[PDB]
Design a protein around this ligand. Structure first.
Ligand SMILES: Nc1nc2c(ncn2[C@@H]2O[C@H](COP(=O)(O)OP(=O)(O)NP(=O)(O)O)[C@@H](O)[C@H]2O)c(=O)[nH]1
Ligand SMILES: [Mg+2]
Ligand SMILES: [Zn+2]
Lengths: 401, 259
């Protein structure tokens, strides 16, 4: 007897590359994010428990208990969604992007590999630095290792998850490929990744990670659907028919706000009348599909029209740096930040470039190539530097206003 | 030819007429839907007039007065409403499809159009409906639709066949690629306006033709299709359109151009 409701929580799925992030997500939802991941993947699932029987196994994905023991229709707890991040060292930029929609995450370490892999460390300290603390570790490719190997590693993961903020960060081996043990993971995520409270009084603010022209080639101007802007709500809640604006909006140099009305609200295959935090919405707008196609409005933010939002070109940042540059094979020490340096400031789901203009103990001023739309005074920011051809995360901070 | 089942047109009626002669103190038009019954269009009733009041243009007009006694008629193109000018215009292409068919079916059956309009079209008229739509069903369904109407069975087949493979070897396609951008909050409506404003009443001016489509092929790149009977009315219609777009657009906050 289940209901059709939009996702309650967003759970990122990070990890070194090819350790099987998308597969695990496909083992929990049946859906897969269309080879290697390049753009953030997305999937939804209803999560229910079997009142009448034994857990892990008691955690149902569909309204059915006649799967292990018996019959009363299991009870609905929530509909969760995942943010399937890429893992290739080059796409780091886009995971941080996704990290800003994460309410909790699932680091995925490959059993059949030397645990501390470059991206395994990066995604790990990346979460800690950001705030995504509700973590669950998942040893995954067990189906192809020694019963001692996969246990020697568990040791290391256990070792690693020590000094850090990963106190009891569960480690659950699974076999995303054979969907083995996924039951306990649901037991896990249904315990450690608890849906957060959402004050809907706050000013509606959505982070955009996608936008596209829905119109199939050949659609007559007659039935042209307006552009769709895909994102994730961080606070408050939007509803169809609202006057909204996209920031920094379209560019001219400057960036003047793109205004529109919420034509539609959709989550997964079903259409709703309102959207709130958790889950990934597709805001249907009445604007020319051109403005929002490939993914033009990625990194923007949507807020109701006539909202007080600073769109800065220059931004002050109270920061901190990592002692080493976990991410390159070589753990090279992070060099001080030098003025006139070009850095990659990742803010919200947006990623931007800017040349450091000022540098003090824990505060730097960046002149961005593109403005950022600052909706709060805490906007977490992560800083990457182009260490060696590839962009590496060397620190983080807070944007001040 | 479109023989009518009446001598004169009902007063206050609308109908496609064609300008046959322009004189000083007036102009004789010709009522198509009535064997080309000559009516009179007096200046006091008219209103670039150079293109409406043309040598052979086909404009739609109201039937001012009808003198059943002298059997003469006067019409006006001013009294015709903007509503009556669109609705009673779609009737044209339909009544213009029925025409070409019969003029061909008969030409083939070494018969006459009047014979083609009294047995076919006139009878399909009883079976409620533009005889052209009752034929619409025939080709798809079966020649059982006509026979039930009482359409002498000399036409039935000659019709069906001649109806299908007609537009084919009578069809030509012209198209252009344009770019349409907007920043308007409802710019998708403005595009659904500027297009359906520029692509308006075109079925009369650049005249007749067969079909027009405007679609999205890319994001801002759209295409326009003008498939008609006369190859040489290609751009004629396509150019006016592509221009109408630019004009209305370059004036409706919608940026439009050709590739
Ligand atoms: N034996 C085994 N193979 C697995 C397991 N999970 C994933 N694989 C395999 O590992 C490969 C890559 O998996 P995939 O899920 O794409 O990895 P990913 O981490 O999401 N890739 P990316 O970082 O590019 O987004 C595939 O061939 C997949 O079948 C597992 O549990 N056991
Ligand atoms: Mg993948
Ligand atoms: Zn059960």
């Amino acid at each position: 007897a289940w209901p059709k409701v939009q996702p309650e929580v967003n759970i990122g799925v990070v990890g070194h590359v090819d350790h099987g992030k998308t597969t695990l997500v496909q083992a929990i939802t049946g859906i897969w994010t269309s080879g290697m991941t390049i753009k953030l993947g997305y999937a939804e699932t209803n999560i229910g428990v079997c009142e009448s029987c034994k857990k892990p196994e008691a955690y149902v994905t569909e309204p059915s208990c006649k799967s292990c023991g018996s019959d009363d229709e299991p009870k609905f707890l929530r509909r969760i969604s995942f943010i399937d991040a890429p893992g290739h060292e080059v796409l780091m930029a886009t995971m941080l992007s996704g990290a800003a929609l994460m309410d909790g995450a699932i680091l995925v370490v490959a059993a059949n590999e030397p645990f501390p892999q470059p991206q395994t460390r990066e995604h790990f300290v990346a979460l800690g630095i950001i705030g995504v603390k509700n973590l669950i570790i998942v040893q995954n490719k067990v189906d192809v290792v020694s019963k001692e190997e996969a246990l020697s590693q568990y040791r290391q993961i256990k070792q690693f998850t020590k000094g850090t903020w990963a106190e009891n960060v569960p480690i659950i081996p699974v076999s995303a490929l054979h969907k083995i043990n996924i039951d306990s993971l649901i037991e896990g995520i249904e315990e450690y990744i608890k849906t957060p409270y959402r004050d809907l009084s706050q000013k509606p603010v959505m982070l955009v990670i996608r936008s596209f022209d829905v119109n199939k080639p050949g659609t007559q101007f007659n039935e042209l659907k307006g552009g769709v802007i895909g994102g994730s709500i961080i606070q408050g809640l939007f509803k169809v028919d609202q006057e909204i604006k996209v920031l920094p909006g379209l560019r001219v140099v400057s960036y003047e706000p793109i205004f529109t009305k919420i034509s539609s609200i959709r989550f997964g295959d079903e259409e709703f009348k309102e959207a709130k935090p958790g889950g990934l919405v597709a805001i249907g707008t009445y604007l020319d599909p051109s403005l929002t196609k490939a993914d033009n409005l990625l990194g923007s933010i949507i807020t109701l029209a006539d909202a007080e939002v600073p769109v800065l070109w220059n931004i002050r940042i109270k920061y901190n740096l990592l002692e080493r540059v976990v991410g390159a094979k070589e753990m090279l020490k992070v060099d001080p930040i030098r003025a006139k340096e070009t850095l990659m400031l990742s803010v919200g789901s947006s990623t931007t470039l800017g040349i450091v203009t000022s540098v003090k103990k824990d505060e730097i001023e960046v002149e961005l190539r593109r403005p950022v739309a600052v909706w709060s005074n805490n906007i977490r920011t992560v800083i990457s530097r182009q260490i060696a051809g590839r962009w590496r995360m060397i620190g983080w901070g807070l944007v001040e206003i | 030819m479109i023989y009518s089942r009446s001598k004169l047109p009902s007063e206050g009626e609308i109908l496609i007429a064609t300008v046959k002669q322009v004189f000083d103190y007036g102009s004789y038009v010709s009522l198509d839907e009535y064997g080309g019954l000559q009516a009179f269009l007096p200046w006091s009733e008219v209103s670039n007039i150079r293109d409406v009041l043309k040598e052979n243009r086909k404009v739609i007009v109201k039937v001012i007065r009808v003198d059943r006694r002298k059997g003469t008629v006067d019409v006006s193109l001013k009294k015709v409403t903007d509503d009556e000018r669109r609705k009673k215009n779609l009737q044209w292409k339909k009544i213009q499809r029925l025409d070409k068919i019969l003029e061909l079916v008969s030409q083939k059956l070494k018969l006459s159009e009047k014979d083609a309009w009294e047995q076919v079209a006139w009878k399909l008229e009883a079976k409620y409906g533009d005889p052209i739509t009752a034929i619409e069903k025939a080709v798809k369904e079966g020649e059982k639709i006509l026979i039930d109407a009482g359409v002498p069975e000399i036409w039935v087949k000659p019709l069906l066949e001649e109806a299908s493979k007609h537009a084919e070897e009578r069809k030509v396609k012209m198209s252009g690629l344009i770019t349409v951008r907007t920043n308007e909050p409802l710019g998708v409506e403005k595009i659904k306006e500027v297009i359906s404003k520029a692509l308006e009443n075109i079925e009369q001016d650049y005249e007749s033709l067969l079909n027009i489509k405007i679609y999205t092929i890319g994001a801002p790149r759209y295409r326009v299709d003008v498939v008609g009977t006369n190859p040489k009315e290609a751009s004629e219609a396509l150019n006016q359109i592509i221009s109408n777009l630019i004009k209305i657009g370059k004036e409706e906050n919608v940026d439009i151009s050709v590739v």
